[PDB]
């Protein structure tokens, strides 16, 4: 019920797992289905997209995003598709640092739209970088999901709450 893959870090401007068509096929991934990244440490839950620079068993992810997930280049991880995922009605997040907060305040334009373009699956304590515009990104930490769940999927109607 999954596949072992090698983690490859990239400079992609999103938090998605970029997968080769072979894996999307083999794993029988469904639209917006979450993927559990299982390892020696605590699992993480990611959103995925089909990479356009492939064509086996390699999963690409932004370097900074991957490190925050406790991943290292070349690590062997087990991708386990999640049969189901609850849709987030509300999500609460806070900047990783005071600087992030200050940047957000001066770059707080439709944060949720930028968020959705770069990440769709969230889980408590997830820490990820989100570009707010061409020049700037901020690190945010997902604090809470509503309904309560180990992981969830962000939607266009998800209420996004930001605290300092």
HSE value, Cβ hemisphere, 13 Å, CA-based, for 150: 11
- 114 contacts 130 by C-beta, under 8 angstroms: yes
Parse the chain into domains and list their residue ranges: 1-84, 85-164
Cα–Cα distances in Å, from 40 out to 7, 48, 133?
A: 14, 21, 35
Fold designation for 85-164: Vcp-like ATPase; Chain A, domain 2 (3.10.330)
- Cα dihedral value 56, 61, 67, 71, nearest 10: -20
Of residues 136, 64, 139, 68, the one with CA closest to residue 97: 139
**Can you give the resolution of this entry in Å?**
2.0
Pairing of strands 3-10, 17-19: unpaired
Q: Which CATH architecture has domain 1-84?
A: Beta Barrel (2.40)
């Amino acid at each position: 019920g999954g596949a072992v893959v090698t983690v490859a870090f990239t400079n992609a401007r999103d938090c998605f797992l970029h997968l080769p068509r072979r894996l999307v096929a083999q794993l029988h991934l469904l639209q917006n289905q979450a993927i559990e990244v299982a390892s020696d440490h605590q699992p993480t839950y990611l959103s995925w997209v089909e990479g356009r620079h492939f064509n086996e068993n390699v999963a690409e992810i932004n370097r900074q995003v991957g490190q925050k997930l406790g991943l290292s280049s070349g690590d062997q991880v087990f991708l386990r598709p999640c049969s189901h995922v609850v849709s987030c009605q509300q999500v609460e997040v806070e900047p990783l640092s005071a600087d992030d907060w200050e940047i957000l305040e001066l770059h707080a334009i439709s944060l949720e739209q930028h968020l959705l373009d770069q990440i769709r699956i969230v889980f408590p304590k997830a820490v990820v970088p989100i570009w707010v515009d061409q020049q700037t990104y901020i690190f945010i930490q997902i604090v809470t999901l509503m309904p309560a769940a180990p992981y969830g999927r962000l939607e266009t109607n998800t209420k996004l709450l930001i605290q300092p």
